[PDB]
Symmetry: C3
Subunit: 94 residues, 3 copies
Amino acid sequence: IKLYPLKKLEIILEGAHKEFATDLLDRAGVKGYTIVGNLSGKGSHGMYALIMIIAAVPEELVGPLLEGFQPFFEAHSGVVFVHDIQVGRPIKFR
Amino acid sequence: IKLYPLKKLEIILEGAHKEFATDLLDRAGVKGYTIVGNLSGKGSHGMYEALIMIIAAVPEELVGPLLEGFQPFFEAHSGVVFVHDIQVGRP
Amino acid sequence: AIKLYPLKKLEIILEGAHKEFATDLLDRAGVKGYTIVGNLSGKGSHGMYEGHLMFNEDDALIMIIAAVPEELVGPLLEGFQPFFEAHSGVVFVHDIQVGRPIKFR
Ligand SMILES: Nc1ncnc2c1ncn2[C@@H]1O[C@H](COP(=O)(O)O)[C@@H](O)[C@H]1O
Ligand SMILES: Nc1ncnc2c1ncn2[C@@H]1O[C@H](COP(=O)(O)O)[C@@H](O)[C@H]1O
Ligand SMILES: Nc1ncnc2c1ncn2[C@@H]1O[C@H](COP(=O)(O)O)[C@@H](O)[C@H]1O
Ligand SMILES: [Cl-]
């Protein structure tokens, strides 16, 4: 048929660390991302400028990408949600 | 890194009830949530051009108790709940 | 206690000027509701889209979220394909669960 599997990350972190995260995605070969701005939240270290970066990636990049974010996330607020998704043309993503 | 299974709720409802919702999350033991504002949308009850969406990763055991706590509210107020399967990293 | 049923959830990301095109497609197919996240930014094959820089707010990127029965995913993607051959954007299909199928089907 017509659908092909991919992975989708939801990366939630402080707005001030946007450049870090996008440069990390770019580096890794991720071909695109979408940024939801002006979010609020609650977590360990209190409540809430938070943003959410959405990135559709081939499964081959999840491992590498989480390794990249781990060091950041040991010293900073935030989280990464990995989702399974399907797309009609995975071309655009690899 | 090791990947572990979790559930992710997306809870869309009128911002006037944000407090009710976050409180409910807090008392059920939800360790965190993220909120998206200034939303617009279409539902059985017409157009919205406000709305908010609450994102909450939680362990599977919490989903059932959470839906039951929201049931009274959603059987008398606009809004929807979407349950996703997600994975999260743990090193 | 609350039973859960499968659906699909689409995330459709495109420039705000085409919002009516995309929602019309949803209405036509029988989609019963949708939620729109506005004022987004993004990097794409074409370049960068920065919501905050647009003079008309309605022109910025948006993301339409639509929970739909799996039967409507084909008819919808067939409609969005030619649009996305000619215009910026992407569609992500998710599996989700909901407690009230009647609200969506
Ligand atoms: N379980 C969760 N669900 C949704 N968002 C979360 C969750 N945990 C953390 N976040 C987001 O990440 C931010 C920081 O969390 P923390 O790293 O725990 O301080 C929170 O303010 C939320 O916006
Ligand atoms: N199928 C759907 N997909 C995404 N969002 C929805 C859907 N149905 C309802 N919503 C959201 O929930 C709000 C309230 O809808 P309702 O509960 O039908 O009045 C709408 O304005 C939308 O933002
Ligand atoms: N891999 C991806 N993950 C998340 N969002 C994307 C991705 N590729 C493209 N987008 C979004 O789609 C917009 C247009 O993409 P394009 O059609 O390649 O210009 C971008 O500005 C992003 O907001
Ligand atoms: Cl619902």
